[PDB]
Paper text:
One family of these GEFs is comprised of the Ras guanine-nucleotide releasing proteins (RasGRPs) that can activate Ras or Rap, of which there are four in humans. GEFs activate Ras-family members by triggering the release of GDP and its replacement by GTP. This module consists of a Ras-exchanger motif (REM) domain followed by a Cdc25 domain. As first revealed by structural analysis of the Ras-specific GEF Son-of-Sevenless (SOS), the Cdc25 domain interacts with Ras and is responsible for nucleotide release, and the REM domain provides structural support for the Cdc25 domain.
We found that [name] and RasGRP4 are specific for Ras, whereas [name] has a clear preference for [name]. Instead, we determined the structures of the catalytic modules of two other members of the family, RasGRP4 and [name], bound to nucleotide-free HRas and [name], respectively. Comparison of the structures of the RasGRP4:HRas and [name]:[name] complexes show that nucleotide-free HRas and [name] are bound in a similar fashion to the two RasGRP proteins, and that the binding mode is similar to that seen in SOS:HRas and Epac2:[name] complexes. An intriguing aspect of the [name]:[name] structure is that the linker connecting the REM domain to the Cdc25 domain (REM-Cdc25 linker) is ordered in its entirety. The sequence of the linker is conserved between [name] and [name], but is drastically different in RasGRP4. The structure of the linker as visualized in the [name] structure is of potential functional importance, because it is inconsistent with adoption of the autoinhibited structure of [name] that we have defined earlier (compare Figure 6A and B with Figure 6E). This salt bridge and the position of the REM-Cdc25 linker reinforces the active conformation of RasGRP and is incompatible with the autoinhibited conformation. The positioning of the REM-Cdc25 linker in the [name]:[name] complexes places the side chain of Thr 134 close to the side chains of the positively charged Lys 172 and Arg 195 in the Cdc25 domain, which provides a possible explanation for the activating effect of phosphorylation of the threonine residue, which adds a negative charge. The high sequence conservation of the REM-Cdc25 linker between [name] and [name] suggests that the linker might adopt the same conformation in the active states of both molecules.
Residue numbers in the entry:
A (entry chain A): 8 to 387
B (entry chain B): 1 to 167
Write the structure that this text describes.
């Protein structure tokens, strides 16, 4: 309950299984199997499971043996990416498999298989590569004639394709450091977020006359409306907040040319993602969602960082008893972030437009450059 | 009763979240939950006026530019916190101020310059005179030195912020 240690909690996770393999209370075992890197490295936890299995083997306790093997099986099936990525954890599982082949006589050895995992480690190491001298201004001419919904859909896909590459290790490193330090996957996701926002900014500042800029503002308001209809709150923030960047907000003359209906809908969307009330509107809408949903990562990262800094990991100075509340609260967030990968967005997307969109999102301008462009479009 | 939106900005190792939790939750936090609405709301009396303050902590959001711009747009007062043990954390506040001054087209913005971790005098690298001179340059705004651990000037941060808002 309150004041548990990693040994007691691991034993509790072992006891949670049945001799047949049935899991009695899956919430506890799912909690500890995801949350334990916060307190103990995964290789060390695997070593502890190994020692428990060996010690139970010496005492001929068949129940403890098969329960431990079922726990390891559930661990492998639930989080395979970590078993592929972590070499020391895989070595511990190798040693345990050898112990099963020796003492179990292949009775429980079939219960553990490490290459049944359809995983691609290099997915997180692979970075994109696109031709030089593209002059990919065709997207500029194209998005004017692009249906808003369609555009929204494609954006969703892109962001979702990045979000799935984030593992628990990345969330842990972020919350521990407060920022992305040696965290290229989450860094790439955040960079894509800001690339979407800056793309909105550039697409708006590209037009030379104020009514045209107001027209593209209306267009992006519609793609934000469709993102909300898509239940994609993350990219919504990307474009809505991109519509409120300093460079575009100070464009008073183009802001005169946007229709009042567009203004009403726009301020409604901005109110949806307000930080007032601790993002209460967003949290309520997300809770009311059914089916696929894309939460705005950054609100939940804010919650995780607040929990990490406010509450202590351990309750004793010896750092052996786990703060049960914190672990639960953190879990309640992270599991949600995990469940996002369970469902795919109901989105059709042709890869050609994906490529065009990625190439357009690639271009980077400093904040000062966009502000200078805004000054060119409308001086003081 | 008037409502105030106060946004807390700063670099990484400043402990602005520490000041926020110390202000709103106090020294004993016993049960804590940052995803609930009134976790950052505190009712406070300043200059005989009852006010409801909401603290917008940018704890892990400073890398999301859109969220930062919406913080700056939606925020009425801004507390730019630095750490007296790091010069870089002090220098990082100029760009933050400029971004606030760009989101709000004006130059006059309610703002307090805060030097946190003031109790660590043996590790101090930025003088009080630096913050005094900078706040004087920044339209002669409020300047304070505080310590979340030593409970120095925690409430005064938002007190003076509300004063600047009413000023």
């Amino acid at each position: 309950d309150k004041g548990c240690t990693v040994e007691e909690l691991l034993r509790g996770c072992i006891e949670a299984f049945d001799d047949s393999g049935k899991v009695r209370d899956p919430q506890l075992v799912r909690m500890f199997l995801m949350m334990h890197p916060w307190y103990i490295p995964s290789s060390q936890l695997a070593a502890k499971l190994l020692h428990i299995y060996q010690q139970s083997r010496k005492d001929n306790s068949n129940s403890l043996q098969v329960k431990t093997c079922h726990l390891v099986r559930y661990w492998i099936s639930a989080f395979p990416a970590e078993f592929d990525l972590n070499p020391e954890l895989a070595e511990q599982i190798k040693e345990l498999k050898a112990l099963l082949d020796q003492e179990g006589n292949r009775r429980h050895s079939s219960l553990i298989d490490i290459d049944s995992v359809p995983t691609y480690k290099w997915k997180r190491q692979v970075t994109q590569r696109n031709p030089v001298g593209q002059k990919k201004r065709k997207m500029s001419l194209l998005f004017d004639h692009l249906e808003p919904m369609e555009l929204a859909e494609h954006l969703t896909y892109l962001e979702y394709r990045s979000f799935c590459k984030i593992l628990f290790q990345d969330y842990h490193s972020f919350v521990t450091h407060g920022c992305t330090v040696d965290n290229p996957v989450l860094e790439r996701f955040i960079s894509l977020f800001n690339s979407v926002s800056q793309w909105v900014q550039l697409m708006i500042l590209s037009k030379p006359t104020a009514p045209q800029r107001a027209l593209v503002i209306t267009h992006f308001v519609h793609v934000a409306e469709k993102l909300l209809q898509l239940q994609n709150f993350n990219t919504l923030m990307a474009v809505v907040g991109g519509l409120s960047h300093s460079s575009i907000s100070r464009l008073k003359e183009t802001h005169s040319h946007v229709s009042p209906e567009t203004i009403k809908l726009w301020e409604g969307l901005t109110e949806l993602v307000t930080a007032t009330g601790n993002y209460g509107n967003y949290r309520r809408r997300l809770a009311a969602c059914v089916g696929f949903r894309f939460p705005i990562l950054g609100v939940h990262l804010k919650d995780l960082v607040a929990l990490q800094l406010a509450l202590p990991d351990w309750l004793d100075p010896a750092r052996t008893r786990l703060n049960g509340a914190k672990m639960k609260q953190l879990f309640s967030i992270l599991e949600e972030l995990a469940m996002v990968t369970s469902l795919r967005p109901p989105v059709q997307a042709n890869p050609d437009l994906l490529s065009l969109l990625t190439v357009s999102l690639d271009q980077y301008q400093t904040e000062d450059e966009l502000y200078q462009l805004s000054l060119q479009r409308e001086p003081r | 009763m008037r409502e105030y939106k106060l946004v807390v900005l700063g670099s990484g190792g400043v402990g602005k979240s520490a000041l926020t939790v110390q202000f709103v939750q106090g020294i004993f936090v016993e049960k804590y939950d940052p995803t609930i609405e009134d976790s950052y709301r505190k009712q406070v009396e300043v200059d005989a006026q009852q006010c409801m303050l909401e603290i917008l902590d940018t704890a892990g959001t400073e890398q999301f530019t859109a969220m930062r711009d919406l913080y700056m747009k939606n925020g009425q007062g801004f507390a730019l916190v630095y750490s007296i043990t790091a010069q870089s954390t002090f220098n990082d506040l100029q760009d933050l101020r400029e971004q606030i001054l760009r989101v709000k087209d004006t130059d006059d913005v309610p703002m307090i310059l805060v030097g946190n971790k003031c109790d660590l005098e043996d590790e101090r690298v930025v003088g009080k005179e630096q913050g005094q001179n900078l706040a004087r340059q920044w339209n002669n705004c409020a300047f304070l030195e505080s310590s979340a651990k030593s409970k120095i000037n925690v409430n005064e941060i938002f007190y003076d912020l509300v004063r600047q808002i009413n000023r």
